[PDB]
Ligand binder design. Sequence first.
Ligand SMILES: CCOC(=O)[C@@H](F)[C@H](O)c1ccc(Br)cn1
Length: 295
Amino acid sequence: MRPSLSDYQHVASGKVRELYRVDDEHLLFVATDRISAFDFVLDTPIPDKGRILTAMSVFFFGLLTVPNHLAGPPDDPRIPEEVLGRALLVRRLDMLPVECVARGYLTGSGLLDYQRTGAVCGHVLPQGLGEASRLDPPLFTPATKADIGEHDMNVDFAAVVGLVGAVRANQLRDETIKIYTRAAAHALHKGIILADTKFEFGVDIEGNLVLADEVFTPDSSRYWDAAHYQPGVVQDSFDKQFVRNWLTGPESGWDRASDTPPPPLPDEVAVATRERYIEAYERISGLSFSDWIGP
Ligand SMILES: CCOC(=O)[C@@H](F)[C@H](O)c1ccc(Br)cn1
């Protein structure tokens, strides 16, 4: 028999994820069905999104050889029925206060910083780059969390040294670039570009660096269709473009520039979005989502 979620202490809440205490040395990482667009958490959930993103994380934890925070199987008895398939049993770690970001392509705040200064997070770049330009080798572009509602602040390597130490900062940079390079090549071989990714790490009792976050989900990473990749224009979001198109189109009745919260989504847009998440998972993993555990 599985415990109730109310048997555990709710310890933290995020935009589309939740965290619970299991005992002194273990936590429960939970993915919800909520989705974000244009910096709003939308009213309408995407069915099975939490389960699909958890399947994705478990696949990539398996593929990568680096230590990670998993402390049990996806069907561990300590996981409540209500979150089965969208929750993981993990070990408690001393977390490092650095958002460890790798970028293989120039977009978002990376592109903006380049267009303003000619550099990104202390990396002076060649002249002549633009939207969705390839960056090779990929860049370590660390950031720090700001206040509620605000975007993370981009920082340089020296800033990271002052947060975690010189030797540890070099380790974060090296492991972030190594892991991203491997995952990106794997996805591209199957027709999906991982344009960038954001990692969070912790340290265990022996001093070892441990990957401790969801990993390579379409929330932590920009997924693009490789078949339509064209440097110089904005790329469609593999998972979120149907949501974006409806919200900004003729039928929503919503003006993005009003900064008012958006309306609920059509049921059919939510179902089409679920299909897109399933397509991304099955193409990258080579597995079938119909075999992933659930309630
Ligand atoms: C950059 C270090 O991050 C942390 O310290 C952790 F708390 C972790 O990122 C976290 C936060 C909120 C939720 Br919900 C789940 N996990």
